[PDB]
Design a protein around this ligand. Structure first.
Ligand code: CB6
Ligand code: CB6
Ligand code: CB6
Ligand code: CB6
Ligand code: CB6
Ligand code: CB6
Ligand code: CB6
Ligand code: CB6
Lengths: 153, 153, 153, 153, 153, 153, 153, 153, 153, 153, 153, 153
């Protein structure tokens, strides 16, 4: 059961500079925290991680998930959340669960960050919990998938 | 370790009518699902549930949590999320973690629902996961509390 | 055949001060005019009147109509018309005819009064006819109910 | 006692196509329903019906009512409600009661339909009751006229 | 197979003044170009041409197409495109293909010209191709009709 | 030397009702005041007066001035000034001086009256001088024409 | 000579948390300061203090002042100032002096706090002077009442 | 009979540079044209001319006109028209006719020039006639004064 | 203990015309009222009064207060309150208490008067109390100063 | 005679999912339809097709057309139409005909889709005709090119 | 070769208070830094420095540069940058290079500071480099002048 | 001492077409001009030049400067300046001086070009000086670096 984790622009710079707002934890560390959570719960999940600064690479990857044995996507589109109708469209055509995560509470920042095009296209949105938000996304993803397949039977 | 769950206007009408958008699950059923989650994880948590249609009662209850042995609040202010500066202020003065939950993805609805005053005052916001969102709030709450007390020592 | 008449904030102050805009007739007098209309037409209707200054009480009352033998609601939400998404939602979940009345023509007043959240959630809206508007609401309610039960057979 | 009923653009297309939103009843049928209401109440009223697609014809007709033995106007300006300051001015200079009717609840439709210039210029506005709204207009007109002439004596 | 071509306000002044923006071709010349296209393709189409400066005449004509053996409408509402909800409604009730044409690219002009109420009600919109845009509308009309009748069988 | 005076919707109702804002003078009286001014100055000017409530008639008349021996237009588009892109276009293609007149100061009224599409298309605009404004238009017109023909030689 | 002091939502939490923006003084301490001012000036005033988190209770209390021997109201509506047309209406019908007080300078905060519906309905507004603002309101109230009764004689 | 002519910022730079938009005529030349008009009509008027670049000097001068034997003001506030509430207030308190003139048609320029605070405070506004606009202002001023004194008697 | 009282544009015209909105009291009379208050309370205060119509003079004066033995400023910027970022900056750099006063309730007037740039830069704002507002400003100033120097010790 | 067809983000996902709004036809099928049109008309045109999800790739390709023997561009920028000033600039510097195509009527969708930066930079725009729109673009392109080269001679 | 350096409101207060945002350097020190730069580069430039708090003095000075042997202007209009259409106009008529400087990055401050009317009228704008910005203006001015006179020959 | 010069979309097309607005100088020529400035001043600077049409490449490059011996960045983000929150974020995390350059005065162009997200994130911004702007950036960069290292010691 494969989950694709997509990390948008600038998230690779996390923690390395300790630049206050986003915190001390690096992107790799966030990804280790995710693995840890997967093992410590015996959840039946293999993660693929992907980070990019290109809007087009985010769309490419969402698209490459379509034909494949990828069950769901957890995504933090970063600054593209607010601007990218294109990623929003790609999310709408993914035909599989997409969950949007934000480290910070984007409700509580500048006006230009409150809107999330991408988040409106997702099933659900998690914001403001730091790295923990990603594990919350994993929990929900596992439940969302469990419930999708339960119904099948 | 006491968590206060506050349920805003109209949420008590959930499920009883099956009114499409919000689902089939009743508010009691959401609260049972929470207890179930608390036991099935052996989490050290006693829940107090409260539902009201009064802005004033939501504020009263947030305030009554202040002096007490209430560790945190999980809240779905419902339609007040978009309008209630008053509840937002109450949340800011609660001096304890507040997590906002929405059944539906309020990013993906009418313009007048995208803004959340109350959500901006909370540490974090969860939207669009149906009842599961509340358990996600629980997970996060337990972790946020764990981490607050870890640092104490 | 029971009709619930809900009167929002400040409407109990009617007439007592003769405060120009709204007129000389008291809220009780409006309610007497309604009974009079019910008898003088031999309409088969028992009215329950309710006035409150609390958003929460309006919602409570709309909700308490749901399980009961209340056939429809006539409501003047007063200044809450313009602000209350919460009452609007309550009206949408009432699953019975709701008609909104206003004494004054809210189209012809300040910008902040032109919007009616609640009115959009109602089947119909009557504005600007003074107390007469309420009898027009009665007429329409009786017809709407007649037509609902005609179709049943 | 003459009442002028003015029907704005496209209302002559009613019912003939059964085009969903507005219903099944034709404009003639609406006018018959009005006569029927006038007889079944023995109201002392002769109706003149007029339908046009021309803003200019609506204004012309409102103006031609001024010198005459027309006591009041019932008007559904249709899509001109939202755009026509010119008809609004005509209504203000009619110096006799004007009541605006809409079949549909214009509060509950697109943003561009919520404004009614013409409705602000009328004494009162009725929306969302289907053809019934016109009889409600008749009821109100008869009362408004009764009350105008009562005060004379 | 009859197509009605409707030309809105001011289009009759085309070319006669060579007034720069719109060009050198007259409205008659646009209509000849259309006939020429119909013959040079052997398309099975009789054109009726109509030009007016009255919003009301455009609506009248759209309505008069309803009962008749008019298969579709090609329309350039001119300045009414931006303002006329009434024509937009008429187009919505025409129950037959309507195609909007603009000589100039209305996206690239003043803000007040970018909105097209009428264009949103049409199946499709062509702008910025000078008189050629009309032939494009003919091509598309013939295809849309071909495809409507193909499906019939 | 022929000047066309165009009077927009409702201006024919002037004075007859003494309806406060616009005054006591009738439209005929305004036109007499113009003739009087033309004689008392020996200006070489024949006036044609035209009043209509139809947008379409205003456009028609501007257009019919084009081929003719009409030297210029004085126009008070009334409520259309604020709404009518169509008339604004007609004015732009008149290829002769157009002067816009308003009785009242449209700067000092409701927001929806401050904009004048038609006024932006005219050479010049006169507002707020009551009927005297028309004579001011005449003066200016005569001067503008004088100066156009002076330059010819 | 009775003055009613109304304190809106959250003001009861003042000072107890020392939550920075509003200060260190408690609501009781604000009320003591007021009594002290009344004695130290020998002003002929009995104060009734009231604090609530309910919009409805504020309206109730304003209304209950109408029939009574309450001469004036000093009110800090708190977060309701910005949102509550209902309280604004109640203030308009109080038919006695109402003075709005704010601890903080609401001009200098978030955009959503600059508007005061309630403040526009009051005779006057005092902001940004901490608890001192209440005594200023007392001074002004005593003067306004002095001047009202002076004129009587 | 004294008329004060106030010329706002930058108008002294007229014509000297021939800077296209405003023309070739200098400010002195405009003032000579005014004198000429006064003589060629035998109008009973002494003009005082004043030009400044200071908002405060415009206000000072308007104020100094109050006590004096200045009968009316003709003013072109220039760029201050759009911005200066202060001059607008000064115009409202002048208690004598003020006419606003603009060389260019400020309706037909940038959005930031369409608003005229000052013009809304004037009795009337003249725009877009070049220097001629000033003589139009003189004509109107003379008539306005004539009519003010006629009534006296 | 010196307080500088700055009076913005047009305030010197007060009362002389009795121009309705602002009242009957002259600016000198307002200043006398202030002296009277200072004596009748034995407050230890010398007032310097200054009125100007120049934005630049207000700024100059604010600046000249900096080096001097001026303890605080009471200012009514008049129409500049709404427009003057420059004065707002000057107030921010005064490094002493500045209190803004308005005779009228600027919340309750035109939209363009609700904003106060200058008021946001002040510690506090008083509006809508007529001349009395100035004495309220004195009371507050004396208290603010008392409290500044109490802390010193 | 080479035409470059550029297909923006997500268009490669067409039809494969049958995702309702855009239809059943795949992108390849759209391109085949284009070739077919080119043959069935004997038009003298070689098409190069290009699809990308990268804004940067669209710009690159537009730029690579400049030096080459590419006569014109037909482009559907997809979601970038609304957001991409950069592509809009590239189109403006292409110095050759660019035609914008949309499958869907972007006038009739969400507010954020009505604006087309790219469409404003194109000579012309076609929307709402499904894949047929591309053939319409071909017809127009061939005519635009024919007319460009006719003039040459 | 004379350069006029104009310094807008409040800039004379620089450094003296060390008021954080703008820095520690006084206005005199900025002017010394400019002389120093002129010598250390042997640039052929005499500087005239001017500081004022009056909008009108800025305009006066720009105007007085016109007739003279002033080659260019470096200007920091301060808070007037955002508000002053009048200075913007003065700049446009200066017919010589004008360069706008800001100490702070006005893009990165409050919304009301992002707009620069004056900056739009300048050839170029420099912001956010502290006092160094002025030397950068000098560099550019010298280059702009060199290039203007190079072309002459 | 290494400076990275980043050139955004379309800038590589400079000069080659002579497309009026931006000029005649090619991007290579701008880079030569920069080297020339570096030698003719003996400044101790090695430049790396980079041009791209990809938002993601700009971010990649800003990021790759972080770990390296790159001292500062000069950047012209081109059309991305107005839209790219992502690049703005990258700039904020670069932890080294970033200077934004624009050839043209973006204040003086379309509304959609006035905003610069990226510019707000930079230390300073230079606009409207053609290619010279880059040398001005160099000058400033060298000074900013000199001053950063001066303080170190
Ligand atoms: C007829 C009907 C039937 C059941 C219910 S429950 C309900 C709650 O109000 C809201 C809840 C949210 O917080 C959520 O999605 O959890 C969204 C919020 O916008 C909405 O007011 C509204 C509603 C309406
Ligand atoms: C002086 C002048 C001369 C000739 C013409 S033709 C004309 C048509 O009105 C309009 C037509 C459009 O539909 C189009 O682009 O074809 C756009 C619409 O905005 C414009 O008003 C307006 C106009 C104006
Ligand atoms: C009840 C009544 C009685 C008489 C009249 S006349 C009239 C004309 O409409 C208008 C004319 C103006 O152009 C003008 O002041 O000359 C202003 C414009 O805003 C208004 O629509 C409107 C109107 C309304
Ligand atoms: C965490 C916290 C701690 C203490 C307090 S007290 C309070 C009052 O609510 C308000 C009062 C104001 O009237 C005022 O400035 O006095 C302004 C209003 O915007 C604000 O909501 C809000 C609040 C919030
Ligand atoms: C015809 C007239 C007559 C007298 C006066 S005095 C005056 C002062 O300007 C203002 C003062 C305020 O600060 C206030 O309420 O004290 C409000 C402000 O908006 C107004 O411009 C404006 C004005 C206007
Ligand atoms: C789930 C889904 C499935 C398939 C596709 S294809 C697609 C293309 O993007 C767009 C194309 C348009 O240009 C058009 O109408 O041709 C409109 C544009 O707004 C839209 O983003 C968006 C999309 C979304
Ligand atoms: C408390 C305070 C203390 C000292 C100073 S100096 C000053 C200058 O005015 C301004 C100058 C700018 O042009 C600039 O950044 O150089 C920005 C402008 O918005 C500001 O008003 C504003 C100001 C404010
Ligand atoms: C047809 C055309 C031809 C050549 C070029 S080069 C170019 C660069 O992009 C931009 C650069 C700016 O940063 C600047 O002024 O340096 C402004 C920005 O808005 C513009 O997109 C835009 C452009 C457009």
């Amino acid at each position: 059961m494969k989950i694709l984790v997509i990390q948008g622009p600038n998230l690779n710079m996390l923690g390395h500079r300790d630049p206050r707002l986003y915190g001390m934890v690096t992107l790799d560390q966030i990804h280790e925290i995710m693995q840890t959570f997967v093992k410590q719960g015996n959840l039946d999940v293999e993660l693929e991680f992907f980070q990019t600064n290109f809007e087009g690479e985010i769309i490419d990857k969402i698209q490459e998930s379509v034909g494949s044995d990828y069950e769901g996507i957890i995504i933090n589109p970063g600054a593209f959340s607010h601007t990218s109708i294109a990623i929003a469209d790609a999310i709408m055509l993914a035909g599989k669960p997409v969950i949007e995560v934000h480290l910070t509470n984007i409700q509580a920042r500048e006006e230009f960050r409150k809107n999330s095009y991408t988040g409106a296209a997702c099933g659900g949105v998690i914001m403001g919990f730091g790295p923990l938000g990603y594990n919350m996304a994993l929990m929900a993803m596992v439940n969302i998938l469990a419930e999708m397949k339960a119904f099948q039977e």
